[PDB]
Structure 1
Amino acid sequence: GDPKRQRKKYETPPHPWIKERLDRERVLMDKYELKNKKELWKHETQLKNFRRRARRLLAARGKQAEIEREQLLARLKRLGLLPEDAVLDDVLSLTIEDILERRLQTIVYKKGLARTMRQARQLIVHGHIEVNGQIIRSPSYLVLKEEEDTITYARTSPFANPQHPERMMIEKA
């Protein structure tokens, strides 16, 4: 036979030039300030996988099925994508925008640490943001609900000083 070969984690469109899909994806890319299409596609694949797990477990029965069902629900609401009282059916109503709201770049922007999405990306990449006492430099990292409030400037960063000229401009917004 053949040994294992590592495979891509995302899927490409079936047809590269469809006008409606191009327009929709362009709107998303502009709004969330992503670097290239593949990054976007990555998140899409994640969404699809969740749905494909929900569809398979609805039509199943037995002992392992219940365990996997509760594990899926717990994982989904640990990420902050579902409320605490959601049921399995609610999985089938998630959208691509729901996942994009959990990116570290977006959350840094929404919390008011930056004036713009691009500034948030630069702040993350250069190492000015700490999450739960740890510095992370990946703008696409998905933030868990339990750690969302412990996101601040790094304690060694120049921005961790309210008199810094650039921070005062950020606070002005």
Structure 2
Amino acid sequence: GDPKRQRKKYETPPHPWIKERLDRERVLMDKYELKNKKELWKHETQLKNFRRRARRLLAARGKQAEIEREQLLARLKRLGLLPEDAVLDDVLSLTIEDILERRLQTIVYKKGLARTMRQARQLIVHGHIEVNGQIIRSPSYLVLKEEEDTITYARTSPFANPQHPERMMIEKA
């Protein structure tokens, strides 16, 4: 036979030029300041996979199905996508916007460390943001709920000084 080949983590659209899909995706790309379509498609795929696991677990029974059922719920609430008292049916009401709100870029903008989404992306890439004492330079990293509030400027960054000129302009917003 054939040895393993590493496969793409995202899926492409079945037709490249459908007007309604193009409009919807353009709105999302503008709002969250993503770099290209594949990035967006990556997140879409993540969502699909979650739903596909819930659809299979609803129609299953036995002992391993229960363990998998509780593991899916536990992982979803660890990422912060569901509240602590959610049930399996709630998996089927998740939207693409729920996942994008968990990007480190979005969360850095939401907390008020930057003035714009674009500035948040540059702050992440240049190495000015620390997450639980560690510097991470990937704007697409999905932030867990347990570490969301320990997100600050890096202690060696120029921005870790309340008198820095660019930080004062960020604070004025």
* Same fold by TM-score greater than 0.5: yes
TM-score normalised by L of structure 1: 1.00
C-alpha distance in 1 between matches for 2:57 and 2:31: 34
Instruction: Give the C-alpha shift of residue 26 in structure 1.
Output: 0.1
Instruction: Give the C-alpha shift of residue 57 in structure 1.
Output: 0.2
RMSD: 0.1
Instruction: Give the C-alpha shift of residue 32 in structure 1.
Output: 0.2
Instruction: Give the C-alpha shift of residue 145 in structure 1.
Output: 0.1
C-alpha distance in 1 between matches for 2:133 and 2:78: 20
Runs of 4+ in structure 1 off by over 2 angstroms are none
Instruction: Give the C-alpha shift of residue 6 in structure 1.
Output: 0.1
C-alpha distance in 1 between matches for 2:111 and 2:140: 16
Residue-by-residue CA offset, 1:1-54 (whole Å, 9 max, x unaligned) = 000000000000000000000000000000000000000000000000000000
Where structure 1 has 5 or more consecutive residues not aligned to the other structure, the ranges are: none
Residue-by-residue CA offset, 1:86-123 (whole Å, 9 max, x unaligned) = 00000000000000000000000000000000000000
Residue-by-residue CA offset, 1:114-140 (whole Å, 9 max, x unaligned) = 000000000000000000000000000
Aligned to 1:91: 91
C-alpha distance in 2 between matches for 1:74 and 1:100: 20
Aligned to 1:48: 48
C-alpha distance in 2 between matches for 1:36 and 1:88: 32
C-alpha distance in 2 between matches for 1:45 and 1:37: 12
C-alpha distance in 1 between matches for 2:132 and 2:80: 17
Aligned to 1:82: 82
Where structure 2 has 5 or more consecutive residues not aligned to the other structure, the ranges are: none
C-alpha distance in 2 between matches for 1:119 and 1:147: 22
Q: Please give the secondary structure, in 1, of the residue aligned with 2:138.
A: coil
Q: Please give the secondary structure, in 2, of the residue aligned with 1:152.
A: strand
C-alpha distance in 2 between matches for 1:25 and 1:38: 11
C-alpha distance in 2 between matches for 1:60 and 1:105: 38
Q: Please give the secondary structure, in 1, of the residue aligned with 2:130.
A: strand
C-alpha distance in 2 between matches for 1:108 and 1:27: 21
**Number of residues of Structure 1 aligned to a counterpart in Structure 2:** 173
Identity %: 100
Residue-by-residue CA offset, 1:46-72 (whole Å, 9 max, x unaligned) = 000000000000000000000000000
TM-score normalised by L of structure 2: 1.00
C-alpha distance in 1 between matches for 2:20 and 2:106: 25
Instruction: Give the C-alpha shift of residue 153 in structure 1.
Output: 0.1
Aligned to 2:130: 130
